[PDB]
């Protein structure tokens, strides 16, 4: 629907007033069919739209909703280094060990992208650094050579 498209676009853009106008019980968890089925919350999380994330969560957005590839909004937040968004999602009950269709967790994303504080956040909430994805790789396995601090963090040594 045109309405849902506009809502998804507003969430992506951080257009709070438009989100407020278009967010209904029926649209808050709509999906971007023409893309990868991201919800308004996936878009707000991935594009670091904090006010929109907060509003959507308050109005019944599903923190656990998976897109077409099995990503939840916490994956989007962690892959793009959005610490505050990640913390909002976790505080609202996001599962930190959630895995997409390829068994990538948010810790796989934060590790591969060199996001130390996000890795640390996830670990404090019980994220498992030993979880292998379908490639048999743990988050530690995906850390760039240069990020020795993240390596040490994930190893626990």
């Amino acid at each position: 629907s045109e309405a849902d498209r506009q809502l998804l676009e507003a969430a992506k853009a951080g257009d709070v007033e438009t989100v407020k106008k278009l967010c209904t019980v029926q649209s808050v968890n709509c999906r971007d069919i023409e893309g990868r089925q991201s919800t308004p919350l996936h878009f707000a999380a991935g594009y670091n739209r904090v006010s929109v994330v907060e509003y959507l969560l308050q109005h019944g957005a599903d923190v656990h909703a998976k897109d077409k590839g099995g990503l939840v909004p916490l994956h989007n937040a962690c892959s793009y280094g959005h610490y505050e968004v990640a913390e909002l999602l976790v505080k609202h009950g996001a599962v930190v060990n959630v895995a997409d269709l390829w068994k990538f967790t948010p810790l796989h994303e934060a590790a591969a992208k060199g996001k130390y504080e996000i890795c640390k956040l996830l670990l404090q909430h019980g994220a498992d650094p030993t979880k292998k994805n379908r490639d048999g790789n743990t988050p530690l396995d995906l850390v760039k050579d240069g990020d020795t601090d993240i390596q040490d963090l994930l190893r626990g040594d």
Binding site: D32, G46, H75, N76, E109
Partner: peptide, 14 residues
């Protein structure tokens, strides 16, 4: 994993 694609979003608002 090309089929996996990438999460909607980006790291820098700029």
């Amino acid at each position: 994993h090309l089929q996996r694609g990438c999460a909607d979003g980006q790291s820098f608002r700029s």
